[PDB]
Predict the 3D structure of the following.
Amino acid sequence: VNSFSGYLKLTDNVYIKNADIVEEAKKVKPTVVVNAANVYLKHGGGVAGALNKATNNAMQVESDDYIATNGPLKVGGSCVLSGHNLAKHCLHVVGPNVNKGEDIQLLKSAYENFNQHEVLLAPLLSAGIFGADPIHSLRVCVDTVRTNVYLAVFDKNLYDKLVSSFL
Ligand SMILES: Cn1cc(CCC(=O)O)c2ccccc21
């Protein structure tokens, strides 16, 4: 048993809910929250910016030190950093950004990072301003992730469309 509440079950291991991932993380304090990051860990806007804002910029400070030491991530790659006040850990995962012309085939590689963690709270990768089709992102998630994933869908209308179109 875990502390996630109000999720709809999509498969054996994937759950979904219309929720603000920031508000969800604050309530659950999951072991792992997934940040939909970029390779520079520049949390300007979106989920990245919203999680970073909720940490009072401590996520960005930690991320800048990580990049100064290690250099940028790969598209499709990840790193584990602190969860600050939101979670034990934050798994920063880089999905391809369609609005920058990155290969959508890298989405599967991005989701494979989730398999290193038994339970995660996550947004849909490569959605919103990354320009991928969220329906596709959910299909890749279900077909790639084998560990238990709790997906927070912010957009109400999108949530309803993801559920009603899910095969
Ligand atoms: C990766 N990513 C996912 C989302 C989540 C979309 C949603 O749950 O509605 C998002 C929103 C704004 C900017 C980037 C975003």
User: Anything to note?
Assistant: Residues 58-70 form the longest helix (13 residues).
